[PDB]
Amino acid sequence: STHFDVIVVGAGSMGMAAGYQLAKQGVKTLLVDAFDPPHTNGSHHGDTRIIRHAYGEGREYVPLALRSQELWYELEKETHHKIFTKTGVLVFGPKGESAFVAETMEAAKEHSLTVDLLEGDEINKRWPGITVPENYNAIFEPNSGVLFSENCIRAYRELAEARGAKVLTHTRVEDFDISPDSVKIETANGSYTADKLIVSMGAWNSKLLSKLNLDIPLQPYRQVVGFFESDESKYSNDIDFPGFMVEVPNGIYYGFPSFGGCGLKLGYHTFGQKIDPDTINREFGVYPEDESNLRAFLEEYMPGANGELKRGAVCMYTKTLDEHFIIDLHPEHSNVVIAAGFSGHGFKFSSGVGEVLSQLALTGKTEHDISIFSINRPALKESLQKT
């Protein structure tokens, strides 16, 4: 019975940000989510998320990283929820043996980002609690840091709803019916129509995009993290222990300083179980790798934080073949915007993506350069399920 200007399916990290940007402009928006964001069934829980500017995944992400940072500061001033803490972000690895470290330094140089460069014992000297080999080098970004992801989504939601946005919770979208001049969604709670559609279902994009005649390789991964009882005199944000993302022989790890004594949080990025969001086991510890992969890191590089496991969380990445995002219009429907495959590193950009999605939905174009996120790029292996 009711139409909308724009309908956002999946009101999570990207969708809720888009909802806020749309509502902010008086655009009558309906956001539909299978749950009640923020929640623990998607990819945004775990309390915290790292934001980096000097981007090791590729220096082309910097502009979006910087715009997103400015938007996070703006959100901080608009809500009572805590949004960002400037812990700084440390990146280290074996000298000359880390592509991630190399690209980070290059990204820094190329965009004139403020960073500190140090090696070996200088790393251990500066940050009691971190022990790396003499052959290790590092780049520290003082001004990037940590975002409180659940708070971000919560704030964007409260703000969007206050502006008129409608949020239909616990309602899973089951199908799509797209037309030349309108879009329609089917749910158990009723059907809804609008002029434009934004699709941002996270891990579920790998299962439901086929409903839009899109055949794109997207693989969901089970990715856990653990909070460990740590030596507060070394790992507390209060004593300036930084957030970090590093690359050692067996891969890439990321962590957060202890906030208010919650313990240092650590996650292993490189490995994760291939899963389906509908059958994934969300209990931490069911796989021996969950806790063992983390402690193996701590015992070697941050021994003082290898205490009791205080809490474990299970979350998901949705990877593309090239690990770059998908942000573009549906190849056959200019009134349909797709946001998918953030491959484990998209939260920091959610504020900026919200803006991009808003622009694409309203005008079919964006001021941002998102060519590398094209849904038609060859490295993606995208195609229609039947042309």
Ligand X SMILES: *Cc1cc2c(cc1C)nc1c(=O)[nH]c(=O)nc-1n2C[C@H](O)[C@H](O)[C@H](O)COP(=O)(O)OP(=O)(O)OC[C@H]1O[C@@H](n2cnc3c(N)ncnc32)[C@H](O)[C@@H]1O
Residue 207 known to be catalytic:
no
Q: How far is the CB of 79 from ligand X (least distance, A)?
A: 18
201: partner contacted, choices ligand X, Cl ion, none (Cβ within 5-8 A by kind)? ligand X
The verdict on 204 binding ligand X (CB under 6 A) reads yes
Give the CA count within 13 Å in the CB-facing half-sphere of 148: 14
The verdict on 46 binding Cl ion (CB under 5 A) reads yes
Of 136 and 347, which CB lies nearer to Cl ion in the complex structure? 347
Q: How far is the CB of 112 from ligand X (least distance, A)?
A: 22
- Going from the C-alpha of 223 to that of each of 63, 97, 139, 230, 295, the distances in angstroms are 27, 25, 26, 22, 15
Q: Which value, to the nearest 10 degrees, does the dihedral of the CA atoms of residues 159, 162, 167, 170 take?
A: 80
The verdict on 13 binding ligand X (CB under 6 A) reads yes
Stretch that binds ligand X, among 69-77, 102-110, 130-138, 339-347 (CB under 6 A): 339-347
Residue 275: exposed, middle, or buried by beta-carbon count in 10 A (0-12, 13-18, 19+)?
middle
Q: How far is the CB of 40 from ligand X (least distance, A)?
A: 10
Q: Which of 59, 67, 104, 315 is catalytic?
A: 315
Take residue 74 and report the two structure tokens written for it.
Answer: 């703006």
Q: H helices within 44-97, ranges in order? A: 62-78
The verdict on 342 binding Cl ion (CB under 5 A) reads yes
| Other residues' Cβ atoms within 10 Å of the Cβ of residue 368 | 17
Q: Which of 49, 222, 234, 333 is catalytic?
A: 49
Interface pattern 345-384 for ligand X (x via CB under 6 A): xxxx------------------------------------
Q: What are phi and psi of 171, to 5 degrees?
A: -125, 105
Give the span between the Cα atoms of 70 and 212, in whole angstroms.
34
Q: Which of 269, 319, 324, 333 is catalytic?
A: 269
Residue 169 known to be catalytic:
no
Residue 315 known to be catalytic:
yes
Take residue 256 and report the two structure tokens written for it.
Answer: 């957060």
Is the omega angle on the peptide bond into residue 38 within 30 degrees of 0, that is, cis?
yes
Which residues carry out catalysis? 45, 48-49, 265, 269, 315, 348
Chain positions contacting ligand X, by CB under 6 A: 9-15, 32-35, 37, 41-44, 46, 49-50, 172-173, 200-202, 204, 208, 223, 225, 254, 267, 315-317, 342, 344-348
